[PDB]
Design an enzyme around this catalytic site. Structure first.
Site, short mmCIF file in Angstrom:
data_model
loop_
_atom_site.label_atom_id
_atom_site.label_comp_id
_atom_site.label_asym_id
_atom_site.label_seq_id
_atom_site.Cartn_x
_atom_site.Cartn_y
_atom_site.Cartn_z
N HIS A 18 4.94 6.76 -1.12
CA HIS A 18 5.92 5.49 -1.12
C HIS A 18 5.44 3.84 -0.76
O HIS A 18 4.15 4.23 -0.08
CB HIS A 18 7.23 5.64 0.47
CG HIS A 18 6.89 5.72 1.17
ND1 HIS A 18 6.02 6.89 1.88
CD2 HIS A 18 6.39 4.42 2.21
CE1 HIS A 18 6.31 6.21 3.74
NE2 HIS A 18 5.77 5.26 3.16
N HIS A 64 0.60 -1.32 0.03
CA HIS A 64 -0.44 -0.18 -0.09
C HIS A 64 0.90 1.08 -0.16
O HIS A 64 2.37 1.52 0.22
CB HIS A 64 -0.84 -0.24 1.38
CG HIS A 64 -0.37 -0.03 2.34
ND1 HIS A 64 0.33 -1.07 3.53
CD2 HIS A 64 -0.36 1.39 3.07
CE1 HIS A 64 0.67 -0.17 4.41
NE2 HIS A 64 0.63 0.57 4.28
N1 LIG Z 1 2.56 8.61 8.86
C1 LIG Z 1 2.18 8.57 9.50
N2 LIG Z 1 2.63 7.27 10.63
C2 LIG Z 1 2.51 7.29 12.19
C3 LIG Z 1 2.36 8.69 12.99
N3 LIG Z 1 2.75 8.21 13.82
C4 LIG Z 1 2.11 6.94 13.43
N4 LIG Z 1 2.48 5.98 13.20
C5 LIG Z 1 2.63 4.79 12.65
O1 LIG Z 1 2.70 4.57 11.46
C6 LIG Z 1 1.95 3.07 11.54
C7 LIG Z 1 1.06 3.32 10.09
O2 LIG Z 1 1.63 3.56 9.04
P1 LIG Z 1 1.91 2.45 7.95
O3 LIG Z 1 1.22 2.48 5.79
O4 LIG Z 1 2.28 1.13 8.22
O5 LIG Z 1 3.34 3.44 7.33
P2 LIG Z 1 3.83 4.03 5.83
O6 LIG Z 1 3.23 2.40 5.06
O7 LIG Z 1 5.76 4.43 5.74
O8 LIG Z 1 3.64 5.32 5.52
C8 LIG Z 1 1.49 2.67 12.50
O9 LIG Z 1 1.79 1.97 12.91
C9 LIG Z 1 1.45 4.06 13.66
O10 LIG Z 1 2.26 3.60 14.59
C10 LIG Z 1 2.25 10.07 12.00
O11 LIG Z 1 2.18 11.25 12.40
N5 LIG Z 1 2.56 10.11 10.55
#
Ligand SMILES: Nc1nc2c(ncn2[C@@H]2O[C@H](COP(=O)(O)OP(=O)(O)O)[C@@H](O)[C@H]2O)c(=O)[nH]1
Length: 217
Positions: A148, A69
């Site tokens: 990303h 995703h």
């Molecule tokens: N993007 C973002 N993620 C957070 C924030 N605070 C916590 N998270 C963590 O982001 C995780 C989910 O993001 P995910 O979609 O898996 O990461 P990504 O794919 O790199 O964007 C959760 O488990 C949260 O603990 C925030 O302010 N912004």
């Protein structure tokens, strides 16, 4: 009142996920076997260590299970700042459940994360969360630069790191510090940005199909 998702985003189809996942792993294979990368392994393994080779696929052991995703807005069910405002937008509600094509322009590796850079169209940019209450978010780069797909994380690394890593890498390319390419892979050119950071600019953008929707945990 109603729960919001944990986060909104584009979720790749089964085929697109497979295709992108395979591309990411092949990249990890070639990078780890690349002479220029091994010459700089001091950024992945610390101390006077035996001159062995690192299997990046293993290094990035925390991988996305199943469907891949691209996150737009992390809402934490409505607890995160700006979560409700984002969810109430017409374009978000209108786009919910709709299909999109995401253009992947590069793959990257740091000592913390591995992922794919997504370049949003302007339609899709409409679904990118406003940074007007936190311009710290995108750090002087165009909106949606953080877009990303996460392909893997080191054992001690939080999930949000990938986005920060990409912005850091892009921040350098902005100042013109990617430098001269240090390798030519089958799918594109390899750049060594220093500090254990590597970027592969795809000759041909990868096109993945995905559904915009909400993830509830
Ligand atoms: N993007 C973002 N993620 C957070 C924030 N605070 C916590 N998270 C963590 O982001 C995780 C989910 O993001 P995910 O979609 O898996 O990461 P990504 O794919 O790199 O964007 C959760 O488990 C949260 O603990 C925030 O302010 N912004």
């Amino acid at each position: 009142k109603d729960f919001l998702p944990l986060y909104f985003g584009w979720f790749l189809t089964k085929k697109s996920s497979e295709t992108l996942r395979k591309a990411g792993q092949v990249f990890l294979e070639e990078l780890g076997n690349h002479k220029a990368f091994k010459k700089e392994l001091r950024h992945f393994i610390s101390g006077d260590e035996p001159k062995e080779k690192l299997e990046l696929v293993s290094y990035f052991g925390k991988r996305p299970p199943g469907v891949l995703h691209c996150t737009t807005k992390f809402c934490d069910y409505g607890k995160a700042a700006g979560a409700e405002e984002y969810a109430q937008q017409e374009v978000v509600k209108r786009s919910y459940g709709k299909a999109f094509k995401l253009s992947i322009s590069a793959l990257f590796v740091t000592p913390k994360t591995a992922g794919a850079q997504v370049v949003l169209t302007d339609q899709e940019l409409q679904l990118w969360p406003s940074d007007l209450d936190k311009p710290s978010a995108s750090e002087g780069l165009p909106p949606g630069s953080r877009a990303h797909v996460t392909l893997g994380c080191a054992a001690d690394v939080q999930p949000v790191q990938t986005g920060l890593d990409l912005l850091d890498i892009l921040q350098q390319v902005k100042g013109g510090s990617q430098g001269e390419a240090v390798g030519e892979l089958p799918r594109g050119k390899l750049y060594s940005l220093g500090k254990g950071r590597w970027m592969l600019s795809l000759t041909k953008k990868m096109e993945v199909k995905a559904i915009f929707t909400g993830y509830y945990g």
